[PDB]
Amino acid sequence: KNQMSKQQLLGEIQGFKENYWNMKDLLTLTNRHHLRVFLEYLDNICSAFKDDKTDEKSARAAYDFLNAQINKLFEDNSKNSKPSFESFSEDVQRFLIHIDTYLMKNPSACSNSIASTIQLLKQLDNKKSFNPEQSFKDFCSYKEITIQLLLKPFETP
Numbered sequence: 001k002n003q004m005s006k007q008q009l010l011g012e013i014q015g016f017k018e019n020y021w022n023m024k025d026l027l028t029l030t031n032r033h034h035l036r037v038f039l040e041y042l043d044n045i046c047s048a049f050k051d052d053k054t055d056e057k058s059a060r061a062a063y064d065f066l067n068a069q070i071n072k073l074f075e076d077n078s079k080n081s082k083p084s085f086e087s088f089s090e091d092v093q094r095f096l097i098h099i100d101t102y103l104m105k106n107p108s109a110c111s112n113s114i115a116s117t118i119q120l121l122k123q124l125d126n127k128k129s130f131n132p133e134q135s136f137k138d139f140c141s142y143k144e145i146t147i148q149l150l151l152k153p154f155e156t157p
């Protein structure tokens, strides 16, 4: 049923949230805080979907997107130094792919400001203008807020 597939996804998301919260002690203090924020977004997806304020395709697309960002948090948790440009460029490209995949699956989520932010993210991926400290801070800023903007449809629909 549509109602059974709905209960299936809510069950998946709850098991997913438990798995990662149960590992939060592996994370640095800062990364724990990022995990709490991402799990709040997962809660927003569940409640919006429970209340039929989003459909299953969109909810699952947002879940997939956050799944990737949560795993990247664990990936980065053993990194404290500034990234090489090679590592940085990989990170920017990967995040852009996750954005594009999400918008392909949930095209109602795009906005002018998300499109503009994609372009500013692309411009960071440029070795000639790369400033190891500033470029990384700017990437992390754009990434934090872009995740918030892409998930905003589930916050108070």
Ligand code: NA
Residues within 6 Å of the ligand: 058, 106, 107, 108, 109
């Ligand atoms: Na949608």
